Amino acid sequence: AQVINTNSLSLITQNNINKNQSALSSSIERLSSGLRINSAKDDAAGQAI
Amino acid sequence: AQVINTNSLSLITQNNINKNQSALSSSIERLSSGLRINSAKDDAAGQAI
Numbered sequence: 001a002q003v004i005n006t007n008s009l010s011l012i013t014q015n016n017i018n019k020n021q022s023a024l025s026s027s028i029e030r031l032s033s034g035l036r037i038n039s040a041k042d043d044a045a046g047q048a049i
Numbered sequence: 050a051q052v053i054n055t056n057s058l059s060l061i062t063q064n065n066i067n068k069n070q071s072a073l074s075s076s077i078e079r080l081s082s083g084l085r086i087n088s089a090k091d092d093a094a095g096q097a098i
Contacts, residue, residue: 005084
């Protein structure tokens with residue numbers, strides 16, 4: 001290898017997984033909850049209606 | 050052989066070894082730590098950035 005001070009590829013991998021973790025959490029919490037809005041974290045325009 | 054008081058070629062050889070010694074020491078210290086800069090006796094722009 002060339003760089004040993006930092007494993008930049010590992011940083012890219014972690015950055016990629018962090019985004020997918022949010023989608024996983026949102027999917028699980030929306031599946032558990034009956035309501036689609038799930039506590040107004042989404043757009044509130046339909047939430048008020 | 051002509052004279053024995055001074056062995057000039059020996060001194061020139063010593064100068065060559067001393068010149069190589071700096072490169073050897075720099076190589077060892079740079080291999081020791083990941084940082085390429087390593088307390089830059091080198092150019093200081095990169096360390097500033």
